[PDB]
């Protein structure tokens, strides 16, 4: 495991406090066998204080999600387009960690809600951690970051009664969509089968934004990231997704875990569309606008390398 | 009220920052119209910083829940049994807040998971806030608070992959239950219909622990709190609860919200069993043991007052998410007992609020404030909302003329520990032998359920244990179930392909106790708020007419009526596409719609008939008003809970009796 | 002012935070000599609160003190700024001000040598507006990204955390000498401005150029200058050091006492106003925070009066919890592209999350505005509001489109000055217009009097002499030499190194008004100044003399302390607790002469040391009664000395002595380098 140095083994040994004092943790210290519990019982307090403070705030969005470790392998030396070290040689390998998620629901909400999905990838490169924080849909609802709380407030549950969980099917969301028409593109994606993928492994990842690749000589090109699934594209049907949300809220996280355990770790080709700085307004829309895709007929994909997830975490909370 | 002062009205006006400067919040400040965003855009950063920090840690348990405000009213002057001020006069009213919850699931998990449920009540009394932090089940899984993290770790999702959500149906939970047999009594309650209540309004509340009532003369008696529902007792069936968890994760919070909004706020009689201190060990078990009930046959309930919930929150986060209950919120006239589960809870709630609030000043949040003056020397801390005038906050002082004054049994209506209480013995980490019978009361509970209820409980166990991967855990489970009931172990073992151990009769008996059965509790005392789905069609004007006529009649009786058709229009509430049997307590098909029950792009194939068939299978009253329909559905015309009438008025009469009966249990198969 | 939030505990029984009457003096125990019980919620609620009382100190300006007041506009300033608080003659706005040192932790001494903070909040009818300034008009560095470098270097060395509240160590002078931008602020800090007599005797400066913006969109460039009405005054170093030990609270007590006696301090809130076209017209860049506009180039315009007249009720709740931000700006004001200011805008909003431990810090009483708040900010730890609008998003129809967007044209919105533009490459490059680090430090030095210049030289001699590294010391001389060869020579003499050869690239002879303390003439008022009368209980006539002097001095609003061997009616303080740092002038009544020429009641020679210290530190001193030579001879103070008084007549003594208190310091008692 990439994180072996931090692992703690409890397959043998006697219970200790956090400072290494052997202790017990099954009965409270009492004044007499039917008496009150004593303040001096440090075994009780350290155990319960830890429990009392186990929870942390869930993510403001993408709270419901699951992760795995893996490896990225470059298909070539990409110096011709980028100085990026992790892309600088054929077969060069970099560890990754990926987290997939729904977007609107809290922790515990169902995997198979109709929603945009998060697809976040960390490359632990030899020149620093590089993250591509993506979604399964290539365009976003809004054109300016300042509007994010408006979008999210409208889609999340109504704030008087906190209803409904993990769903756009309520007045406030459709009010926002209808008053803020930039939302139409992502809305159509979310209303298609892309809103209910068969699994994390059967969906693609997109950076959404135009980024730049920069060479060591300072020249740059405009790029879009596209993680193309090697398992194929597949969706649920809506009635099926609803039933699954009840019968197995953990469906996508279980599907990922299981695939990895059986030696069927999922793969994506990591790709970019690459265009010149001069094409920023050439395609009939602005490349600065995250509500637009570059049609593949205008700019084809280049395969940069292989992303493979093949190791489940050891402790979900910690990782 | 501390809340009215903090209500903020945004129905008019121009947008401002948090410091009152009018601003806009729709476009970022940029270096040119297609340029980068500027660091000096303080409008952007304040808005996004607030968004970035909206979330707070969910509660460690009972994370999923819903709250409402109301009033408690005392039936009498109870000075004869307690010094408690909120109970000191006939008709004395005290404002309350109640939050109900599941127990294991995270904050976005489904209301209709099978679980113990929380039922926490705050009384904002004229002598301080008093909380009773209870559950819908009267006994708890474990006998010492130090074991709480073990229980909770075992029932919550496995910590490598965080699977499964809001469910005991996995190896670790059953490993814990089978290795810690104290768990059996609460386990049998959770595996009964009490694990899947029809609503928060149709369950009771229990303080679980024995507490004390203490009089102003210092004498004390032992008490158990029981909040008895005036709506009656009702459960879902398991398959229904499963479907509901997917179709409407908000089912219980919506049910509560809607009942309050329609002026049908739920009610409970706040009751106690009261017994003498000399009876701590007189009933065949120890009253300090939280895994035991006192049978009502040994100690009847005394009704103290009425609890009614009648007003929904204004802001969920500020009120329901932020309410911080404590069993340490106690008032004069109440005291603790030496129940080692209760003893340790006292520490936990004060501590965990530091985690949720991020600061020590959580009692200053409006929902947590008392309704009387606060006089003490607590100072500073992050989020300090007070400006204290007393500049000598120490006791003893002369510089503030010796104020505040100490309050105790004698002076200032002080809280005081029941003066009869003593301790004697060694300082020990030992369990009392009086706690050792883990199986008799679970059997008592089992014996007290009706045959079909017993079958439902066996089937819940067959479902969950069949999902346990470890053969050794499954055997260990059978060992414990067998000590409660050989027959239970046999019947569960049958579904999982194991043999039950031989009968071990040490704890078997045939005693029963009143008031624990749901099925046995008789028809509901009110059908107000109950949901009727009328399945109709837009293809036939007769169908829409029958539905309209049925509607006005059922609505007058306080039923919530939904007319379902292919598409929305005048008179139609819901489409077949969004409708499900879990949305209704009874289902009626109108004659004119017969043809749909025999394909459409407007709904899934067979949807109309599946709604009727699911409703029947799940034991709900069903009917045809105006059969081809009963035959398509395989529903017997002579069945109890099946209605067939031409006369709208006769139909309504019969169907309303069926809603009160609630479930027709003769539709469920029993073991041979 | 914050009346709505006050809690009175002058009566009543102790309760928990939830209003249950309780006790809090004895723990609940299993028997009279038994262990304490976990069920004791009285104990745990009280100790938990105590355990959590402390919050992180501010990252800089940790040590400080605040008061409430009023700002009153002198005019309708509509013709230069849309700012609502300046829109009518006589318009009043509540304020809160906090003053501070800069480097020291909480509990470090007020009289450290340092930059001082001077932060002012105007609770305007269009939102809270903060000017977060210093008592020195220029800052050490030209880019916000360098602040942690500066602060790490000035703060204690991080292996042992030494020294507290002081630039007198290797790392600080290493930074100063490697980052020459620091020279201007350095010279200010090494002058008497680094050791102000009180918060009331220093000025406040915004430092950065900001903009005034009219409703029509036109703007001008401004610098804020809060000019003290009490006058300018400093301590001498060797007094500041003793005072750090005798009274770490000297400045906060001075301020608190002045407000309580009805002498609340006042400043004229002023601006220099210049056209946008003048950004580079004065021989430097107005975006550079290491530069002043000489008053000869742009005169001060008085906008209004700031008066502090009310002390806080609870220090923690008010002074400790006040959270200032330069991002608390109002319509009519705007930022400039000063790269130091630019980064500050990020820092203050971020750091309050650290102090408050949650995002709702604007809801603390001291931080709340005095006008309604209408926005869609929600939840977050510690959320006090209960929002009625259940559709907190824009655009909406379900709340009828409220709140409405405010901007230049609607709802009196803030707006960025519409004439502002940017052009060029996206760069991490310093403007060459920022490159002159030395001419202004020299302008400052040239503007001080001869004795003032010596004091600055001596401050540098003191500090640099404590730098262990020979390389750092040489580097420091290299930089000082670029400002002034004479400074470098004089400093070098103390540290046994050779100054390098004169390098006149930046030398010049120009001077500027308003920066000298010594040159700012006698104090405009002597109210609040402290007179210690040394007396004795051994002679009833010494006490009589002390009482007559007191009556005559208190008439003119001086704060009088009578000092004797022991307390009694008419005596305020014993010799044991008295010190010269406690007084602005010292008088000995001739009846007490014998004390000046051993006791278990005070340290040996204490009465004389008070008199000698006060003399040596430049204060007015004297003997009242006619017999002065025994005292003056013992003290070695010349009777003919300037600021040395000797009269038999109490009236005549006081008249002369009060002139000396206004002169404040007698600078002829300090030696000068030849
Ligand atoms: C192109 C549009 C966007 C995409 C594809 C995107 C993607 C994501 C993803 C995948 C995560 C979860 C990462 C994980 O698994 O831990 C995330 C979290 C987050 N996002 Fe973004 N996001 C976008 C826009 C925004 C905007 C405009 C904002 C705010 C201005 C924002 C604020 C956040 C916050 C506050 C979190 C929680 C982060 C954490 O706690 O670590 N998102 N988003
Ligand atoms: C008689 C058995 C128990 C019952 C009936 C009970 C009841 C409850 C209820 C109803 C809540 C949620 C209150 C709300 O709605 O906000 C709660 C929360 C909590 N409980 Fe208990 N509980 C019991 C045992 C324990 C034990 C033994 C411990 C720890 C030693 C414990 C620790 C907590 C913690 C940490 C929370 C979250 C509190 C908060 O964040 O405000 N529970 N419990
Ligand atoms: C012109 C130069 C500057 C002046 C006059 C200045 C002034 C001040 C003053 C007076 C305070 C204390 C306010 C109070 O009494 O609460 C303060 C605090 C602070 N300053 Fe600045 N400062 C300057 C530069 C900076 C820079 C460049 C940064 C960082 C980029 C910065 C970061 C801070 C932080 C983190 C605090 C603590 C703030 C708080 O906790 O509320 N300062 N500064
Ligand atoms: Ca809504
Ligand atoms: Ca498990
Ligand atoms: Ca049942
Ligand atoms: Ca150092
Ligand atoms: Ca914190």
XYZ file of N, CA and C in Angstrom, chain B residues 3 6-26 29 39-40 42-43 45-46 49-50 53-54 56 127-129 314-315 317-319 322 328-330 336 343 346-347 350 354 357 360-366 370 372 374-376 378-390 395 400 403-407 412-415 417 421, chain C residues 2 5-25 28 38-39 41-42 44-45 48-49 52-53 55 126-128 313 316-318 321 327-329 335 342 345-346 349 353 356 359-365 369 371 373-375 377-388 394 399 402-406 410-414 416 420:
543
model
N -36.186 33.104 20.256
C -36.189 32.892 18.790
C -36.799 34.058 18.005
N -34.498 36.809 16.972
C -33.480 36.432 15.990
C -34.028 36.063 14.600
N -35.346 36.209 14.403
C -35.969 35.953 13.092
C -35.572 37.078 12.157
N -35.145 36.715 10.953
C -34.663 37.680 9.968
C -35.570 37.625 8.742
N -36.090 38.788 8.355
C -37.097 38.939 7.278
C -36.384 39.447 6.016
N -36.444 38.672 4.939
C -35.832 39.038 3.664
C -36.897 39.078 2.562
N -38.117 39.476 2.924
C -39.200 39.510 1.921
C -39.144 40.803 1.091
N -38.323 41.767 1.520
C -38.127 43.027 0.799
C -36.679 43.457 0.971
N -36.261 44.484 0.232
C -34.948 45.064 0.441
C -33.887 44.682 -0.587
N -32.771 45.393 -0.497
C -31.635 45.200 -1.355
C -30.622 44.351 -0.606
N -29.951 43.490 -1.357
C -28.851 42.680 -0.864
C -27.746 43.471 -0.159
N -27.333 42.996 1.023
C -26.198 43.559 1.746
C -25.172 42.467 2.177
N -23.970 42.899 2.490
C -23.006 42.013 3.164
C -23.522 41.745 4.593
N -22.796 40.911 5.338
C -23.123 40.639 6.752
C -22.866 41.846 7.647
N -22.248 42.879 7.083
C -22.075 44.099 7.855
C -22.900 45.242 7.258
N -23.967 44.927 6.529
C -24.969 45.946 6.167
C -24.661 46.813 4.958
N -23.588 46.497 4.224
C -23.221 47.285 3.029
C -23.974 46.739 1.820
N -24.795 47.574 1.140
C -25.467 47.033 -0.042
C -24.478 46.604 -1.147
N -24.716 45.425 -1.736
C -23.780 44.843 -2.700
C -24.581 44.078 -3.758
N -23.893 43.499 -4.753
C -24.518 42.558 -5.690
C -23.812 41.208 -5.452
N -24.317 40.125 -6.038
C -23.664 38.811 -5.818
C -23.815 37.860 -7.011
N -23.899 38.412 -8.224
C -24.198 37.605 -9.421
C -23.053 37.518 -10.415
N -15.854 40.225 -10.018
C -15.072 41.368 -10.520
C -13.864 40.863 -11.289
N -8.613 39.287 -6.680
C -8.518 39.040 -5.245
C -9.296 40.098 -4.426
N -9.374 41.349 -4.914
C -10.068 42.422 -4.183
C -11.605 42.305 -4.264
N -14.263 41.384 -2.644
C -14.755 40.989 -1.336
C -16.216 40.477 -1.374
N -16.995 40.837 -2.407
C -18.367 40.348 -2.509
C -18.357 38.868 -2.796
N -15.689 36.801 -2.189
C -15.102 35.997 -1.119
C -16.008 35.834 0.113
N -16.723 36.867 0.535
C -17.615 36.674 1.712
C -18.763 35.660 1.485
N -17.041 32.135 1.065
C -16.544 31.702 2.390
C -17.704 31.180 3.215
N -18.834 31.887 3.217
C -19.992 31.399 4.002
C -20.488 30.094 3.467
N -18.303 27.097 4.433
C -18.356 26.725 5.838
C -19.762 26.430 6.302
N -20.705 26.174 5.399
C -22.083 25.914 5.854
C -22.250 24.679 6.715
N -21.676 21.435 9.313
C -21.172 21.161 10.650
C -21.225 19.650 10.831
N -38.047 27.115 35.512
C -36.927 26.826 36.407
C -35.788 26.156 35.638
N -35.675 26.470 34.343
C -34.607 25.932 33.492
C -35.067 24.913 32.462
N -34.256 24.718 31.421
C -34.582 23.746 30.392
C -34.399 22.339 30.957
N -38.987 27.475 11.411
C -38.807 28.477 10.356
C -37.563 28.156 9.532
N -36.461 27.826 10.219
C -35.254 27.410 9.537
C -34.744 26.083 10.148
N -31.959 24.249 9.758
C -30.596 24.215 10.290
C -30.518 24.917 11.648
N -31.102 26.111 11.738
C -30.942 26.939 12.929
C -31.649 26.308 14.119
N -32.754 25.595 13.863
C -33.594 25.065 14.951
C -33.376 23.551 15.137
N -29.446 22.482 14.830
C -28.673 23.043 15.942
C -29.137 22.721 17.383
N -28.197 15.888 31.108
C -27.712 16.805 32.136
C -28.588 18.045 32.320
N -29.462 18.335 31.356
C -30.446 19.409 31.504
C -31.556 18.907 32.370
N -31.337 18.996 33.676
C -32.255 18.462 34.681
C -32.740 19.642 35.532
N -31.077 11.637 39.075
C -30.596 10.504 38.325
C -30.658 9.244 39.181
N -25.504 6.939 33.755
C -24.372 7.620 34.383
C -23.386 8.184 33.344
N -24.381 11.167 30.845
C -24.266 12.526 31.378
C -22.992 13.262 30.893
N -21.901 12.522 30.765
C -20.639 13.067 30.272
C -20.705 13.347 28.773
N -22.586 16.713 26.914
C -21.920 18.019 27.078
C -20.671 18.112 26.200
N -19.428 20.321 21.886
C -18.187 21.002 21.482
C -17.800 20.652 20.074
N -20.772 22.190 17.618
C -20.823 23.648 17.598
C -19.490 24.314 17.295
N -17.668 26.586 22.866
C -18.266 26.213 24.122
C -19.546 26.985 24.392
N -19.916 27.918 23.497
C -21.062 28.774 23.741
C -22.369 28.309 23.052
N -22.495 26.990 22.875
C -23.676 26.422 22.203
C -25.026 26.657 22.912
N -25.030 26.833 24.238
C -26.298 27.111 24.951
C -26.836 28.522 24.626
N -26.021 29.338 23.961
C -26.440 30.686 23.508
C -27.196 30.717 22.174
N -27.158 29.602 21.437
C -27.925 29.514 20.198
C -29.400 29.642 20.599
N -30.197 30.386 19.802
C -31.593 30.655 20.218
C -32.400 29.416 20.603
N -32.526 29.265 27.520
C -33.663 29.073 28.411
C -34.632 30.248 28.258
N -35.706 31.903 31.009
C -35.547 32.618 32.281
C -34.132 33.190 32.324
N -30.241 34.150 33.090
C -29.059 33.311 33.337
C -28.135 34.112 34.249
N -27.807 33.579 35.428
C -26.864 34.273 36.324
C -25.714 33.364 36.659
N -24.579 33.501 35.995
C -23.429 32.720 36.432
C -22.117 33.343 35.994
N -19.627 31.897 34.109
C -19.042 31.395 32.857
C -18.730 32.580 31.936
N -17.530 32.596 31.350
C -17.101 33.751 30.593
C -16.368 33.315 29.336
N -16.251 34.261 28.403
C -15.388 34.215 27.228
C -15.755 33.004 26.374
N -14.741 32.361 25.784
C -14.952 31.245 24.840
C -15.283 31.800 23.460
N -14.943 31.048 22.397
C -15.304 31.439 21.019
C -16.821 31.600 20.902
N -17.276 32.592 20.124
C -18.702 32.785 19.878
C -19.486 33.343 21.068
N -18.808 34.079 21.947
C -19.439 34.657 23.136
C -20.406 35.758 22.698
N -21.712 35.515 22.872
C -22.751 36.461 22.437
C -23.226 37.442 23.526
N -22.789 37.234 24.774
C -23.187 38.111 25.900
C -22.153 39.204 26.185
N -22.606 40.319 26.756
C -21.723 41.350 27.294
C -21.987 41.400 28.804
N -21.127 40.741 29.585
C -21.377 40.585 31.018
C -21.027 41.831 31.759
N -21.965 42.352 32.534
C -21.697 43.552 33.340
C -20.909 43.312 34.618
N -20.995 42.112 35.187
C -20.361 41.859 36.467
C -18.886 41.623 36.255
N -16.613 33.451 43.031
C -17.252 33.215 44.334
C -16.186 32.598 45.221
N -18.643 42.242 44.035
C -19.991 42.266 43.415
C -21.072 41.916 44.449
N -22.865 38.287 44.864
C -23.746 37.759 43.828
C -22.964 37.167 42.628
N -23.523 36.141 41.947
C -24.769 35.422 42.234
C -24.683 34.613 43.515
N -25.855 34.373 44.120
C -25.972 33.569 45.343
C -26.072 32.083 45.007
N -25.430 31.237 45.806
C -25.559 29.774 45.670
C -26.997 29.300 45.891
N -27.488 28.405 45.029
C -28.808 27.790 45.178
C -28.683 26.305 45.524
N -33.140 29.464 47.099
C -33.201 29.780 45.672
C -33.695 28.682 44.738
N -34.494 27.730 45.249
C -35.054 26.640 44.445
C -33.943 25.899 43.671
N -32.787 25.747 44.320
C -31.640 25.030 43.733
C -31.918 23.579 43.397
N -31.288 23.070 42.332
C -31.274 21.624 42.120
C -30.585 21.010 43.335
N -29.256 16.871 44.782
C -29.248 15.424 44.643
C -30.178 14.812 45.722
N -29.828 9.317 48.842
C -28.881 8.509 48.062
C -27.558 8.262 48.788
N -24.087 48.766 22.931
C -24.345 47.328 22.811
C -25.282 46.864 23.950
N -27.351 43.447 24.399
C -26.616 42.207 24.651
C -26.044 42.080 26.065
N -26.253 43.101 26.900
C -25.680 43.103 28.251
C -26.422 42.182 29.178
N -25.677 41.565 30.078
C -26.210 40.632 31.043
C -25.894 41.137 32.441
N -26.927 41.328 33.247
C -26.681 41.841 34.584
C -26.728 40.750 35.641
N -25.702 40.714 36.470
C -25.592 39.729 37.515
C -25.371 40.442 38.862
N -26.010 41.593 39.050
C -25.865 42.351 40.314
C -26.802 41.773 41.394
N -27.701 40.871 40.990
C -28.628 40.204 41.909
C -28.871 38.797 41.436
N -29.540 37.994 42.259
C -30.061 36.708 41.795
C -29.289 35.478 42.253
N -29.905 34.311 42.060
C -29.271 33.025 42.359
C -28.509 32.477 41.152
N -27.372 31.830 41.413
C -26.618 31.123 40.382
C -27.478 30.151 39.601
N -27.359 30.172 38.273
C -28.025 29.195 37.428
C -27.030 28.598 36.422
N -27.393 27.445 35.841
C -26.679 26.944 34.675
C -26.925 27.871 33.483
N -26.291 27.551 32.366
C -26.503 28.313 31.135
C -27.912 28.091 30.591
N -28.607 27.088 31.125
C -29.983 26.863 30.743
C -30.995 27.277 31.834
N -30.560 28.118 32.765
C -31.473 28.760 33.720
C -31.908 27.912 34.914
N -31.276 26.757 35.112
C -31.539 25.951 36.320
C -30.714 26.454 37.497
N -31.366 26.842 38.616
C -30.588 27.284 39.791
C -29.693 26.162 40.348
N -28.424 26.472 40.586
C -27.455 25.480 40.995
C -26.503 26.142 42.010
N -25.525 25.370 42.481
C -24.416 25.846 43.290
C -23.150 25.530 42.492
N -22.007 26.060 42.920
C -20.782 25.820 42.157
C -19.536 25.828 43.027
N -19.700 25.562 44.332
C -18.575 25.655 45.270
C -18.017 24.334 45.791
N -19.821 17.070 43.970
C -20.620 15.943 44.481
C -19.733 14.712 44.619
N -19.153 11.353 38.328
C -19.331 11.746 36.936
C -20.669 12.453 36.742
N -21.674 12.098 37.545
C -23.007 12.724 37.395
C -23.069 14.197 37.820
N -23.060 17.440 37.034
C -23.159 18.279 35.858
C -22.844 19.742 36.217
N -23.021 20.120 37.487
C -22.655 21.458 37.926
C -21.158 21.685 37.751
N -19.072 19.843 35.819
C -18.600 19.735 34.419
C -19.000 20.939 33.546
N -20.218 21.462 33.679
C -20.573 22.638 32.858
C -19.628 23.852 33.162
N -15.876 22.874 32.040
C -15.818 22.883 30.559
C -15.737 24.329 30.016
N -16.607 25.208 30.511
C -16.548 26.601 30.110
C -15.209 27.181 30.383
N -12.413 26.104 28.027
C -12.553 26.590 26.669
C -12.604 28.094 26.566
N -12.203 28.809 27.618
C -12.288 30.287 27.628
C -11.407 30.982 26.557
N -9.177 31.877 23.156
C -9.297 31.760 21.696
C -7.909 32.141 21.166
N -24.779 52.965 6.203
C -24.653 52.179 4.966
C -23.659 51.004 5.149
N -23.481 50.542 6.390
C -22.603 49.412 6.655
C -21.372 49.799 7.435
N -20.741 48.805 8.057
C -19.533 49.014 8.814
C -18.385 49.313 7.881
N -17.501 47.317 28.468
C -18.058 46.634 29.644
C -17.319 45.301 29.922
N -13.019 40.948 26.852
C -13.054 39.826 25.915
C -14.131 39.993 24.866
N -15.369 40.201 25.301
C -16.495 40.258 24.368
C -16.366 41.390 23.344
N -15.758 42.506 23.750
C -15.665 43.707 22.904
C -14.277 43.868 22.283
N -12.760 40.315 20.893
C -13.520 39.761 19.793
C -13.713 40.689 18.571
N -11.608 44.949 3.976
C -12.692 44.615 3.066
C -14.045 45.099 3.541
N -14.119 45.575 4.786
C -15.319 46.294 5.252
C -15.286 47.698 4.716
N -15.752 47.827 3.481
C -15.689 49.083 2.742
C -17.138 49.483 2.421
N -10.550 50.649 -3.514
C -9.176 50.213 -3.304
C -8.281 50.794 -4.397
N -3.773 44.932 -1.604
C -4.426 43.872 -2.365
C -4.486 42.512 -1.621
N -6.628 42.228 1.710
C -8.074 41.989 1.515
C -8.434 40.508 1.730
N -7.518 39.619 1.376
C -7.736 38.175 1.554
C -7.550 37.802 3.036
N -10.380 38.352 6.194
C -11.579 37.508 6.124
C -11.189 36.083 6.505
N -11.739 33.229 10.751
C -12.162 31.836 10.889
C -11.313 31.150 11.970
N -12.384 32.993 15.498
C -13.755 32.708 15.904
C -14.039 31.217 15.977
N -17.755 30.480 10.936
C -17.888 31.475 9.873
C -18.841 32.608 10.237
N -19.469 32.530 11.420
C -20.504 33.508 11.766
C -20.024 34.649 12.697
N -18.730 34.984 12.595
C -18.082 36.017 13.422
C -18.690 37.424 13.269
N -19.349 37.698 12.141
C -20.006 39.024 11.960
C -21.240 39.173 12.840
N -21.681 38.077 13.425
C -22.859 38.120 14.290
C -22.516 38.403 15.746
N -21.238 38.400 16.093
C -20.839 38.791 17.445
C -21.265 40.246 17.632
N -21.738 40.608 18.841
C -22.306 41.948 19.045
C -21.421 43.090 18.524
N -23.501 45.157 12.307
C -23.750 46.493 11.799
C -24.977 47.075 12.519
N -27.528 48.473 10.837
C -28.578 48.551 9.842
C -28.931 47.114 9.479
N -29.557 43.471 7.695
C -28.791 42.589 6.821
C -29.790 41.804 5.965
N -29.602 41.832 4.645
C -30.447 41.090 3.703
C -29.581 40.340 2.738
N -29.314 39.071 3.028
C -28.564 38.253 2.068
C -28.866 36.769 2.237
N -26.668 34.270 2.733
C -25.729 33.495 3.554
C -26.498 32.689 4.593
N -26.118 31.422 4.781
C -26.913 30.499 5.628
C -26.063 29.542 6.441
N -26.656 29.033 7.524
C -26.071 27.942 8.315
C -24.682 28.281 8.866
N -23.799 27.288 8.933
C -22.487 27.508 9.470
C -22.557 27.388 10.992
N -21.448 26.934 11.579
C -21.370 26.765 13.030
C -21.716 28.079 13.718
N -22.499 28.018 14.787
C -22.739 29.192 15.592
C -23.765 30.139 14.998
N -24.592 29.636 14.087
C -25.589 30.466 13.398
C -26.639 30.976 14.391
N -26.642 32.292 14.612
C -27.624 32.933 15.529
C -28.943 33.356 14.866
N -28.945 33.610 13.556
C -30.168 34.098 12.925
C -31.115 32.949 12.611
N -32.410 33.262 12.579
C -33.410 32.309 12.128
C -34.049 32.938 10.876
N -33.543 32.565 9.707
C -33.982 33.175 8.447
C -35.375 32.757 8.017
N -36.246 33.734 7.779
C -37.592 33.472 7.247
C -37.660 33.164 5.744
N -30.533 33.503 -5.843
C -30.800 34.476 -6.903
C -30.372 33.827 -8.232
N -39.346 33.927 -3.931
C -39.283 35.055 -2.968
C -39.427 36.406 -3.687
N -36.369 38.938 -4.284
C -35.660 39.556 -3.176
C -34.710 38.552 -2.534
N -33.570 39.034 -1.989
C -33.108 40.456 -2.023
C -32.733 40.970 -3.416
N -32.934 42.275 -3.668
C -32.569 42.837 -4.970
C -31.094 43.193 -5.043
N -30.502 43.048 -6.235
C -29.074 43.374 -6.435
C -28.850 44.873 -6.292
N -27.849 45.270 -5.509
C -27.497 46.683 -5.352
C -26.248 46.975 -6.149
N -28.656 51.314 -8.459
C -29.835 50.910 -7.685
C -29.444 50.491 -6.277
N -30.245 50.895 -5.299
C -30.081 50.447 -3.920
C -28.805 50.865 -3.195
N -28.122 51.910 -3.683
C -26.915 52.468 -3.037
C -25.820 51.412 -2.911
N -25.706 50.569 -3.926
C -24.671 49.527 -3.905
C -23.238 50.004 -3.893
N -22.358 49.238 -3.234
C -20.950 49.454 -3.490
C -20.735 49.330 -4.997
N -17.147 49.333 -7.813
C -15.742 49.620 -8.111
C -15.635 50.937 -8.940
N -11.301 52.605 -13.403
C -10.179 51.691 -13.173
C -10.042 50.675 -14.315
